[PDB]
Amino acid sequence: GKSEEELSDLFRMFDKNADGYIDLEELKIMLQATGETITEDDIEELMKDGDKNNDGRIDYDEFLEFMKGVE
């Protein structure tokens, strides 16, 4: 369930630069915050499949997809 209700927050929950776009520079900070010591295959491997735009970040579209009610 949850719906876009939780997804909306998640986006910001992940956004630490208040820009409306997540980046790798932040991702790592997200992991180290929830448990560093994470292989590099978890930062890119995750972003890659979450970077349909291939810009090095996430959007309100791709994010809403990869963020199908996470956390």
Binding residues for Ca(2+) are 15, 17, 19, 21, 26, 51, 53, 55, 57, 62
Query: Contacts with ligand EMD in 8-47 (CB under 6 A)?
Result: 14, 22, 27, 30-31, 34-35, 46
Compute the distance between CA of residue 43 and CA of residue 22 in angstroms, rounded to an integer: 12
Size of the site for Ca ion (CB under 5 A): 7
Helix (H, G, I), strand (E, B) or coil at 30: helix
Q: Is 62 in the site for ligand EMD (CB under 6 A)?
A: yes
Would you say 15 and 22 are in contact if contact means Cβ atoms under 8 Å apart? Answer: yes
Q: Is 46 in the site for Ca ion (CB under 5 A)?
A: no
Compute the distance between CA of residue 8 and CA of residue 11 in angstroms, rounded to an integer: 5
Which residues bind to Ca ion, rule: CB under 5 A? 15, 17, 22, 26, 51, 53, 62
